[PDB]
């Protein structure tokens, strides 16, 4: 039903986006509002296949008192089981609990899912920001440390990527003279493509050049490795292997596989 005040000569209705949102019934003079039927995306939440074969399904942005049956387009099949209503849509196949842990699989507005032992099952909860803590504040009290710890951490950063080049004639027309002559009428796109790719390659070389070439000399470590008890054997180069790389560098080069 519509409460719009149609003028006695107009029949249709439009909106800001120029779409039909009202109509007038011909046989009986009445105004009717038209709304599109529900639609959305479907997401599948799963742990690794090495762990289990259970899954959960999220219907995004849909009140699912209105969808026990709907088609999948990209077929009708329903699941039932346990139905929970969230802000991002609604969830089928997962159970809501009252606890709170660290987020494992993000879902929506503060809701995460995990694979727990309860047997094992898939549960949903509200993420926890951290452990509560209150510091004892006073206007004549202080705290001073009495010991210390040495810590070592790592940080990984990309520097450069692969340099590629493309040929227009070979890619587009292969080895056909007629195709090349026909393509000749399209202007000078190929020069632009070649220039862009060449600039990218030169930039790629300059990145490494400016990151690593920070020194002018090539210093060498003393033959005897005594530094007051500190042991740098894990990061200094190893001459036994032909690659002349530290153990950590060897591990890093083995880990990354094309």
């Amino acid at each position: 039903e519509s409460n719009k005040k149609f003028l006695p000569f107009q029949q249709f209705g439009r909106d800001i986006a120029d779409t039909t949102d009202a109509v007038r019934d011909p046989q009986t003079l009445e105004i009717l509002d038209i709304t599109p039927c529900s639609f959305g995306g479907v997401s599948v939440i799963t742990p690794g296949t090495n762990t289990s074969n259970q899954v959960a399904v999220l219907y995004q942005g849909v009140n699912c008192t209105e969808v026990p049956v709907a088609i999948h387009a990209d077929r009708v099949y329903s699941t039932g089981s346990n139905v929970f209503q969230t802000r991002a849509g609604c969830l089928i196949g997962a159970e809501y609990v009252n606890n709170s842990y660290e987020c494992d699989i993000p879902i929506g507005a503060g809701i995460c899912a995990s694979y727990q032992t309860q047997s094992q099952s898939i549960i949903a909860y509200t993420m926890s920001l951290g452990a509560e803590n209150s510091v004892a504040y006073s206007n004549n009290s202080i705290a001073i440390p009495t010991n210390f710890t040495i810590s070592v951490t790592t940080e990984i950063l990309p520097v450069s990527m692969t340099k590629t080049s493309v040929d227009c004639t070979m890619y587009i027309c292969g080895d056909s003279t007629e195709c090349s002559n026909l393509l000749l009428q399209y202007g000078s796109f190929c020069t632009q493509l070649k220039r862009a790719l060449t600039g990218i390659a030169v930039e790629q070389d300059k990145n490494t050049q400016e990151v690593f070439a920070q020194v002018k000399q090539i210093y060498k470590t003393p033959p005897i490795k005594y530094f007051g008890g500190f042991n740098f054997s894990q990061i200094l180069p190893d001459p036994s292997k032909p690659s002349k790389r530290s153990p950590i560098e060897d591990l890093l080069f083995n880990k990354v596989t094309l």
């Binding site: 210390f148 790592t154 940080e155 990984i156």
Partner: protein
């Protein structure tokens, strides 16, 4: 010792705990290989570059088999079946579609190259500031008070090992802002006044090491009737 002095700890702290610090450093450097090897997703940043390049090239080469509304996707088939004055209508669609494929590939490459350049600039700055010197910027060369860093190479990237100092085993204490003596106020030169319950000492801030209050580690500069919370004791000469 210089690097400890650079974060507010005296040298005798290092010189009297040399073996303990060396052992802690050795254990920490030992744990790194296990930490890197055990975690599988530790090097996702370096793997994403290879994955994206391979995916883009695969998509570009796969696009060659499309028809774009033509009779066939092979130029030789059209050149062997049809005649000159009609093959143009079919060839034009292929030429156009391959042109947009190439343009899309090039634009995506440029957009990725910009991000790679930004990351490389950050890496260069970190090399200059954390490795060739000692940094006072908070949380720039690790978590804690920075001491020194080491570089390592990796496929398409760099890895930084940061060494930091972390306090531990704190303790309650009572404190005062100034000391009143002979109608004069006394403030510490470097440190803070502290009390164990019955006596007053002066100590440094990042390590507990009490000393006797003396005129050699305080300055007077004032009177006793202005400061709030002053506490009166004796100052040795």
């Amino acid at each position: 010792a210089y690097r400890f002095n650079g974060i507010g700890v005296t040298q005798n702290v290092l010189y009297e705990n040399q073996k303990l610090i060396a052992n802690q450093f050795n254990s920490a450097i030992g744990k790194i290989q296990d930490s890197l090897s055990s975690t599988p997703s530790a090097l996702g940043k370096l793997q994403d570059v290879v994955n994206h390049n391979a995916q883009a090239l695969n998509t570009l080469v796969k696009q060659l088999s499309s028809k774009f509304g033509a009779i066939s996707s092979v130029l030789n088939d059209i050149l062997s079946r049809l005649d000159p004055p009609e093959a143009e209508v079919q060839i034009d669609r292929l030429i156009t579609g391959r042109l947009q494929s190439l343009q899309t590939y090039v634009t995506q490459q440029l957009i990725r190259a910009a991000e790679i350049r930004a990351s490389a600039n950050l890496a260069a700055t970190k090399m200059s500031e954390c490795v060739l010197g000692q940094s006072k910027r908070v949380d720039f060369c690790g978590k804690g008070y920075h001491l020194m860093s080491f570089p390592q190479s990796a496929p398409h990237g760099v890895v930084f090992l940061h060494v930091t100092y972390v306090p531990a085993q704190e303790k309650n204490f009572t404190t005062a802002p100034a000391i009143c003596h002979d109608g004069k106020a006394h403030f510490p030169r470097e440190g803070v006044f502290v009390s164990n319950g019955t006596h007053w000492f002066v100590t440094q801030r990042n390590f507990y090491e009490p000393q006797i209050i003396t005129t050699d580690n305080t300055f007077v500069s004032g009177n006793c009737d202005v400061v709030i919370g002053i506490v009166n004791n004796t100052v040795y000469d």
